[PDB]
């Protein structure tokens, strides 16, 4: 992964900053994966990343993982904090609860990354990409 | 722990810039978080300020004067600027977009070769300057 | 010595204006006076 340092009071970030960094994390992972799979055309890389980085696919991946008995107590608390955060303007072509349920996923990824829980985040996004691409 | 690609030189196109975009975004966002801000509005405002096309262009131009780079860096910068692709945004011209593409391609090539010692230093300097 | 009619007494009293008022100033401060 990258070479960062810890940020003081990383257990007190609201549900929004976590998703703010987690969106970037997920973008990095999915782009590196699509590039590793073998592709050069930026048009096709966008047309494909916009299949896994949409709120619909994210809510779907979240429901799939959750219904598979994958998480633990603290990840459940981080999910509830991500989904309970109320702000923003809903996108014009989506529901307003799948939005919340995808923000929960991004908050989970961000909180996992901001605590140096590297391998768990790695395997989680591995299974997420594997599902989404299938 | 990202497994290496088959080759980091045959990426003739913009894939380097494609990865460098998200790399630079991750870095600037984590930095803004370390500063202390938590509200998303001003976070996004400063992020856009530092990640815009003209900002990256000016950072590249300024770092060009410090001779901070070596030969292969000029090689990848040239290979990036010889890219002809897509359409430039309506808000900006066709010139500075090429400088931004060059900067993003350089960042991506640095990232994709496990040279974090150069990458962290480069992004630290770029952010430090852009926050002037 | 405020009074609505100021005028020199001895030969050496001057008459000046300050901030839109009429003042008589001198060396012997018994003669110093101001209109209004």
């Amino acid at each position: 992964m990258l070479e960062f340092d810890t940020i003081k009071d990383s257990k007190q970030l609201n549900g929004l900053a976590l998703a703010y960094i987690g969106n970037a994390i997920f973008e990095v992972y999915v782009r590196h994966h699509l590039l590793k799979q073998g592709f050069t055309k930026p048009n096709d890389l966008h047309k494909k990343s916009s299949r896994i980085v949409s709120a619909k696919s994210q809510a779907e991946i979240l429901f799939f993982l959750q219904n598979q008995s994958f998480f633990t107590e603290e990840e459940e608390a981080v999910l509830k904090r991500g989904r309970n955060a109320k702000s923003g303007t809903t996108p014009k072509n989506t529901d307003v609860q799948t939005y919340r349920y995808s923000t929960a996923f991004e908050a989970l990824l961000g909180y996992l990354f901001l605590e140096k829980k590297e391998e768990r985040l790695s395997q989680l996004v591995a299974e997420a990409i594997q599902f989404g691409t299938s | 722990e990202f497994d290496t690609i088959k080759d980091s030189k045959q990426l003739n196109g913009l894939a380097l810039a494609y990865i460098g975009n998200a790399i630079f975004e991750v870095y600037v966002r984590h930095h803004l978080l370390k500063q202390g801000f938590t509200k998303p509005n001003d976070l996004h405002k400063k992020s856009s300020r530092i990640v815009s096309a003209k900002s990256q262009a000016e950072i590249l131009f300024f770092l060009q004067n410090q001779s901070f780079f070596t030969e292969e860096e000029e090689a990848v910068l040239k290979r990036g600027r010889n890219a002809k692709s897509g359409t430039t945004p309506k808000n900006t011209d066709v010139q500075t977009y090429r400088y931004s593409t060059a900067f993003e391609a350089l960042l991506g090539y640095l990232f994709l070769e496990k040279k974090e010692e150069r990458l962290s230093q480069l992004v630290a300097e770029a952010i430090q300057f852009g926050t002037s | 010595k405020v009074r609505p009619s100021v005028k020199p007494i001895c030969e050496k009293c001057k008459v000046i204006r300050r901030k839109g008022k009429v003042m008589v100033i001198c060396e012997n401060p018994k003669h110093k006076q101001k209109q209004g």
Binding site: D9, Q12 | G36, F37, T38 | -
Partner: protein, 207 residues
């Protein structure tokens, strides 16, 4: 500055070393807990939150549970906010014990007065009576309402109504003794509020 939160228990007396009587008010406490920090980049001021006197889990709802479960402690019953303070010697979850007041200091005490009900004028506003003899029919009534010319009553008259129950601050009290063991604070004088009530003991503002 500094401050804590406690419970009034009742007045007593102590002899000093000179051998002289001193009225004393007892105030118990416990380890308060910092639950939140309000910095100037998120809000418009500087302030920490303090908790006190935890309550059993059946009397707490899910919002409060989740709020107080980010400092890893138990649902607190009294939540307040101490504003003017240095904000580098305080971390979420850390405690604020009673051992921060030495003897002979000078503090302020904020508390809610005790209620008196619906009171008249002679008692609420401390007015005077008319006569009780000499043929009078006037006593315990609030007086003339004012001049005739305004054709109305001036805003600011003083009439009956509900007395007490407000918030009051007494200034320039003084610590006598600080029993570090039992979490006690002996303050000289008396303090507002009924027994078994919340009392805020901050440092002195005037100096």
């Amino acid at each position: 500055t500094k401050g804590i939160l406690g419970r009034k228990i009742g007045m007593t007396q102590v002899f000093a070393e000179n051998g002289d009587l001193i009225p004393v008010t007892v105030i118990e406490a416990a380890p308060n807990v910092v639950l939140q920090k309000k910095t100037a980049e998120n809000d418009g001021y500087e302030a920490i939150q303090l908790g006190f006197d935890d309550k059993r889990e059946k009397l707490s709802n899910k919002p409060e549970k989740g709020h107080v479960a980010k400092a890893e402690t138990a649902p607190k019953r009294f939540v307040k906010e101490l504003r003017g303070v240095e904000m580098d010697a305080y971390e979420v979850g850390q405690e604020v014990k009673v051992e921060i007041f030495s003897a002979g200091e000078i503090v302020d005490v904020t508390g809610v007065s005790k209620g008196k009900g619906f009171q008249g004028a002679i008692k609420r506003h401390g007015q005077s009576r008319g006569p009780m003899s000499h043929g009078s029919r006037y006593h315990r009534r609030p007086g003339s309402m004012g001049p005739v010319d305004p054709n109305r009553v001036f805003k600011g008259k003083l009439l009956p109504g509900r007395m007490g129950g407000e918030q009051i601050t007494v200034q320039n009290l003084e610590i006598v003794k600080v029993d570090a063991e039992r979490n006690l604070l002996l303050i000289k004088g008396n303090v507002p509020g009924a027994k078994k009530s919340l009392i805020t003991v901050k440092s002195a503002v005037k100096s």
